[PDB]
Amino acid sequence: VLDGPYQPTTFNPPVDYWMLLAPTAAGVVVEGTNNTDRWLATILVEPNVTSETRSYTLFGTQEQITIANASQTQWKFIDVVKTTQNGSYSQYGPLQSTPKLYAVMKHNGKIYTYNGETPNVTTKYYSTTNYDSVNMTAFCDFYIIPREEESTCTEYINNGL
Ligand SMILES: CO[C@]1(C(=O)O)C[C@H](O)[C@@H](NC(C)=O)[C@H]([C@H](O)[C@H](O)CO)O1
């Protein structure tokens, strides 16, 4: 029933499908850009991290990002975004997670990602021009779930595979 797992790759996912990502290591989970007004990379941060600056490879280049994770026990997925090519990266929409799963979707002129704290997650979005043609690079195994089955994706984010 569940469509996957697919191996790490860059492709152009259809609109109104969730890319359910199953990372195993801390670090960059997924990234995508329209090359004009949106870059988004999701970073997975370890439980229990006091403010510190780390180096991440985002869109092929080293970037210094100051990260934290206030939770003693839960993972933190962070959307690191910029809105112009040479802009600074800013952090939004944290998901605190036990199951270690995330998902991203292209929908209605935006990129959506999961947010909040498992097991009661919600979603939030980032307006993105030419949203439909955004290529996503997965750095881990992933699955594909139609928006019609969002309740299934939400259950996976909340409770695991
Ligand atoms: C312009 O308004 C919005 C948008 O994109 O539609 C509203 C949206 O709710 C908000 N999402 C979050 C997680 O904060 C988003 C980001 O602040 C911004 O895209 C970051 O670049 O801004």
Swiss-Prot record:
Effect of R38A: Reduced ability to bind sialic acid binding
UniProt subcellular location: Virion
Domain of life from the UniProt record: Viruses
Region (Spike head): 2-161
Disulfide bonding pattern of the chain: C140-C153
Impact reported for S127A: Reduced ability to bind sialic acid
Site description Binding to sialic acid, residues in chain: R38, S127
Function: Forms the head of the spikes and mediates the recognition of specific host cell surface glycans. It is the viral hemagglutinin and an important target of neutralizing antibodies. In sialic acid-dependent strains, VP8* binds to host cell sialic acid, most probably a ganglioside, providing the initial contact. In some other strains, VP8* mediates the attachment to histo-blood group antigens (HBGAs) for viral entry.
Protein name listed in UniProt: Outer capsid protein VP8*
Organism encoding this protein: Rotavirus A (strain RVA/Monkey/United States/RRV/1975/G3P5B[3])
Span covered, complete protein: 64 to 224 of 776
